[model samples]
Target: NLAPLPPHVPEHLVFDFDMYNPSNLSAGVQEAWAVLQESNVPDLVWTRCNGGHWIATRGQLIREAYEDYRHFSSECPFIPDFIPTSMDPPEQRQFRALANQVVGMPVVDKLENRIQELACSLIESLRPQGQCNFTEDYAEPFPIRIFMLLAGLPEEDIPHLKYLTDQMTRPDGSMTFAEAKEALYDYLIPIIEQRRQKPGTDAISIVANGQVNGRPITSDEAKRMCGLLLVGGLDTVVNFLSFSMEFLAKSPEHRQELIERPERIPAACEELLRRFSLVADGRILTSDYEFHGVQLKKGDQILLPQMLSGLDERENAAPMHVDFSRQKVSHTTFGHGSHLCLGQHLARREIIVTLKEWLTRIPDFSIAPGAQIQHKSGIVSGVQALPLVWDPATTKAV
Candidate 1:
């Protein structure tokens, strides 16, 4: 079903790309999006898919757009304006500070031992099992449980919360966007109310009772901000771990490189973030303007793909290849500008910890024989399942 062409959009500029279900996704999510950066694909092209929107294919344009929020407003950053992420400057700054109090470096450092412990525990439990679904057994549980602990949410509530969060990005046709958001809001309303009266050390309570712009935060503001926190807590690192582990499972040399030089784990993580960068969100044009020879109208949506930024050849030479030793590894995997991902410090720590701990225990592992790995495409792309197999004797009980 082709979207009707907007009169102002030139025919040659139309690429008809679908962000949710990209054409070359079978190759891999990042690979699928790289198609947009192909020599022939324009740096800025309009896609009729998703009801017609502009896509910034290279890092330069994406960075510029993110920096110039006045032109590219964050008013409707995603499908919904769930708070700071969707608010621009001055206003966005306040909520971001409060958010930082929760997932920032200080909080990450506070939870370092637990993060390392959980990664080790999860890996050790699966070390005895020669074969396991890495996505389920390790990826999902590692960061999520940590975040649940951080938010002080009951472990039992994950299924319900996760379902709602997942729907916001990858809808299954069951719930409308409004319905899914409302469901998430409904669940948090009581929690936010209770926390306001009796604050705790948890992230949610901090946000519930904390102030923004020197005034006590309102219940509505807290819920909206908490909703963004929930999505960030549950979504970001979970998919990232899968991509990292899947890569390590397939590439023995890379694993050996990390196993030999443990200090390079952070470097390897950065390289991996560039090579397999995932996540794409759009911003709406605030006013009609000419950008790189194309006229973008007000209210038009433009997708600035964080996944596509570092992958752009112009940004990094031989973009697709992962080189841990590469002198300069650049990417927006965590995002860019005012709305840059707040959980990045925590995410990096988690990724580094997983790499160090997993390699220390199960240094030798690979995809199950005769199994084909599938990638799912959406706002955040991820491996559908990572079935890994290794020798029990080779694994150490760490």
Candidate 2:
């Protein structure tokens, strides 16, 4: 039912994860590879897709691989690492440094009030409805707006920016990665030029007019970094919020717990990321290396999947279950070590705000009957559509 690997590959180590599909019937995305943990699959496996690659299942091993930049290069860390994101080590670190300065801790602190105001306003408007698509109605808007404000971009640009990112990830059924990236760059050219002409305190302006290592950054560098931020902010957290919302709606007890203990939201978010680490991808090893008796050669590729990580039985008790109180919450959802996601602080704050606001108002909700809830798995994994229902009378303005 699936494609076979090349003869050069060892039969026992092969891993077939047919990722390019409208629907993943076998695994249903998250649950598919979860089947592996139930069985005895090693931490690493050889896979063939964009090309041959390796996959790590446990949090410890994946963490080590990501941290050991020398052994597992991020430079082309992906099957096709040429993409700005796939770069590993010294180069990747430099680019990450450039990115972190604009989106890191200090920047998040500066924008915290603005982000809170936006969250409060958005939740207030939706409180009266008592029912909505959390994905589009709130999650999408919150981060997109924050991202626009962060980049010093015009709010009007959101529709177009979302469109471009959609093409690269969700694709309206007609565009390649290269095409989408180029289109995005085209969209950014003028914005970068304009920011350069009259710099503002925003991220785009900072990159446009600022210097990296005492030299002015290139226009391309600014645009690529901006594009990455747009995608990361817009897609990743939006879906993550939606996923958590779905869980909360399904379990009112969890909602009540959050309401009673707002402080638990941060820890709960960590657990959620662990229970549902949905993103998936692959990376090609540039050099031949043997790992746990498996023979790997240069040009051989491996899958660096995200979703099935926290499911490892060794890491947490009842790995599939969500437990906020679980000690040592092990998860690589935002990634690890050097390649840790730059915007994690902003994500944490946004999640904490949503949970506090939502539970404080609508303390109970459920999925609409006969309504189809679908999920998409890729660089990010989330519900394709979420339909929720609740009594409006139950909620009051906070």
Candidate 3:
């Protein structure tokens, strides 16, 4: 069972007045996060959600906790429950080590050209349609394909791999956490075997055959680490692409900035990550400690919902709005320090390729009228559906 919350914060705010409250939550996900920062809430707060856990509201707190491995343990970073992320620093570093090597410069360097080709191919397919469900047709495929290629996975396996990762991150609204995790593990069983027998340059093989702590890593460990990579690489980038596209769709001026000056995408990616941070920042306390005024006992639950601070309008002018031309972009979407996202370079490259290629063919797009887009709220917040319409004449076949 997941850990229970303390007595201090006892109820979930179906509505938090301090945050941004948009006219429609499903449509504007960040607007929902905006509710928490409207009143200038402090860096941390005890919330009664997922059975009452402390929420870190500022980037400062999120950064401090992430860096202070001793005070804020990653081993159980998720509120009310800790999984691999909850593992303490030294131990967590083991898993991270394998990932860092596989996703590091050398691996990415080799696959860079291939990943770009795949992105262009995927984008080209939908270019003629002008308006596509950016999430399904464009966004998901771009990153998922990159992940498959990077892992040296066969094209046939992409559907299954994506299905499992989707189940893990964005559940079908029916499966329990344990059920989903087990299902993913069960599927990885044979894939792990296949990779072992026919080892290749893929990340799984590198980790399986390579050294870990001066000893050969076990199969179980390999699966978990690979599982993390697949999920991390696929889902986050996929959502990021859709979010950036949606933002572009809604705001033409900003979109034009990127379209005219493609070089801005990298800086834009960083700015977007900060303004529209992916989901939340999670952590668990290492020992009894007093943060601000509240005293958290060892094992106390803490969640730095990434939005609390990033969405604070006071923190950034027009905080909820998107501006690709911004000069100074700052956000912890990729995390900080020892735990910065191992696949960040790959993600940025994918987004940059997506923006450049996407704009080249279908330079103009906007959200369709009467279309409904919903954002799922949980561990990862993202668009459930994106409906847009564009002219077919503008696109040229790839």
Candidate 4:
């Protein structure tokens, strides 16, 4: 039910969009969110869909709000909170730094070979099959498997853990956030304990036993951070790959350019990340303030979707078109400000590897006939399933 507009909001600025269940979600999640940026919509409009909140539809407002984290509190940047991402800096500093240490760039360098190997293995396995459900067959397993290997967890735990991770972002009401959070924390408890007692060389063991403020990381604190990492690890790149791959399946011209000149895959990766950008986390207001000429209350919630930044026409001309070679592929796909997505380097490595590996093996593929693609909307947008088909004769084993 839509709430009555707060008296402070002007009628002209009202654009009641449901961030959780966007009206146009079936067509595309990003396109659905892009409605707020229509010429008629204000830069900052109040949407009653998610309980009467503000949405910064343009890149300018999105960038500015994140920088001024003081006024737009990160206390609850999401409809929920998950460690450093939701916690504002200063006290949120140590956790953020430590978490990055585990999931950051240095580790990406270490895992580079494994990342490529995983992509090649997955692509080659799927290539011989001729047709496959890309979402179920490739996207989910690729990232989740790597995350499992990195954290020293068994592959069999994927279904339950990935499901709980999904519930946090896109749920079917099978589980509540509290339930999901606890289930994940519950699963991590013993592991966190085990890791703390005898630290191992995996990501989980690192964060589970690491120090905070000169003191050993508590079991519960370790669980929270670990759960956040698990969710971050599962939720993003998995969905991101499908969106990128799904786009390539249909855009043959784009695929040809990459296949002919594989050297451009890295640049194409940036453009794909820009165009297919996902994640729409928002920040809460700490105090009443005037922003972009709009009066926001102390407690008003504002969605600062990282998805929209790169897609904003003002940020990149022809926002939706995929032009890999186009210089200046500006975006906040990794997120922006104090809480930038830490898996960015890792995520980029996975994407670039996937693009190069997949095209090298399965250079030509397309969406299955008579199948309409579907997308899910939530904090993390995703493709329901991607059924890709190709001529087995045209595929390579290398």
Best by TM-score: 4
Off-target runs (Cα >4 Å) in candidate 4 are 79-81, 170-175
Question: In what order do the candidates fall by TM-score, top score first?
Answer: 4, 1, 2, 3
Candidates sorted on lDDT, descending: 1, 4, 2, 3
lDDT score, candidate 3: 0.69
Candidate 2 lDDT over 307-358, as tens digits, reads 6557777777788777789888876777766767788898888888778777
TM-score of 4: 0.95
Error of 2 at 222 (Å): 1.5
Q: Score each candidate by Cα lDDT.
A: 0.86, 0.73, 0.69, 0.85
Per-residue alpha-carbon lDDT of candidate 3 for residues 1-398, written as tens digits (9 for 90 to 100): 22344554334422222222234475477766655554545556665445556766666777777778788776676544222454666767776776787888777787878877887777777766666787888778777777777677788987876776777776787678777777777876677777778888777677676566667777777767777777777667777777777777888888778878887777887787776676665677778897766677787767766555566654677776677666665566777767777887777777777777777877778898887666655566677778877887866566
lDDT of 4 by residue, 59-114 (tens): 98899998888998877766534676667778788898889878788889999999
The model with the greater lDDT, 2 or 4, is: 4
Best by lDDT: 1
> Which 10 residues in a row give candidate 4 its minimum summed lDDT?
77-86
Better of 1 and 3 by TM-score: 1
Candidate 1 off by > 4 Å: 79-81, 166-179
**Cα-based TM-score, every candidate:** 0.95, 0.91, 0.88, 0.95
* Cα lDDT, model 1, residue 311: 90
lDDT of each residue in 150-214, candidate 1, tens digit only: 98988898788767877886799999999999998999889889988897899988998988787
Output the lDDT of residue 151, model 4.
88
Q: Model 1, residue 121: what's the lDDT?
A: 86
